[PDB]
């Protein structure tokens, strides 16, 4: 439960409760569980602290919660420091990955306040 400083759920099959990490989707979830070597749909509650330790030294290979936090931080700050098209889209709150804007792209756009 406690692994990576986060508090993944109990009675939720491990192959999915592993994915609760900000830095591990299903890919790293399945990969770490295979590298450690435990059955698939076991609930996290049935996993001992030594199993948590194996998972700990295994996720110590992938990027983790705070690692990915600082990584995305440094990447966007890199785009900024460059001050490119991507960085300016970022800083001004617009789509970045090359989409249309006039009507759609509401996530990058914001709400309809004015």
């Amino acid at each position: 439960a406690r692994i990576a400083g986060i508090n993944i759920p109990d009675h939720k099959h491990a192959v999915i409760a592993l994915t609760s990490i900000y830095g591990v989707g299903k890919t790293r979830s399945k990969a770490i569980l295979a590298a450690a070597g435990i059955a698939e749909d076991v609930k996290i509650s049935e996993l001992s602290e030594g199993q948590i330790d194996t998972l700990r030294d295994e996720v110590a290979k992938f990027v983790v919660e705070g690692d990915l936090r600082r990584e995305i931080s440094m990447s966007i700050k890199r785009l900024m420091d460059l001050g490119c098209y991507r960085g300016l889209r970022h800083r001004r709150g617009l789509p970045v990955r090359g989409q249309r804007t006039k009507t759609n792209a509401r996530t990058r756009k914001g709400p309809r306040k004015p």
């Binding site: 890199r78 420091d81 460059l82 001050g83 490119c84 098209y85």
Partner: protein, 82 residues
């Protein structure tokens, strides 16, 4: 991004101009056109005037502006907001 097998791409005019640059002084920028060109080592340190479609606006090459293309720093539309 570009196919790795093809490696990078850069047009020979800017290539040779910036070679001359790294050779014999660089106090002046380059008035290129090829916005798509891959930033190379021998362009670092200059203040290249990259084309925006109408102007060749300056941008200083930094060790972080290496894995990029020239136009990435010359905006193409004068945005002002509403």
């Amino acid at each position: 991004p570009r196919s790795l097998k093809k490696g990078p791409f850069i047009d020979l005019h800017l290539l040779k101009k910036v070679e001359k640059a790294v050779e014999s002084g660089d106090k002046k920028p380059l008035r290129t056109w090829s916005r798509r060109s891959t930033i190379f080592p021998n362009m670092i340190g200059l203040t290249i005037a990259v084309h925006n479609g109408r102007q060749h606006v300056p941008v200083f090459v930094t060790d972080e502006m290496v894995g990029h293309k020239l136009g990435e720093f010359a905006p193409t539309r004068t945005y002002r907001g509403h």
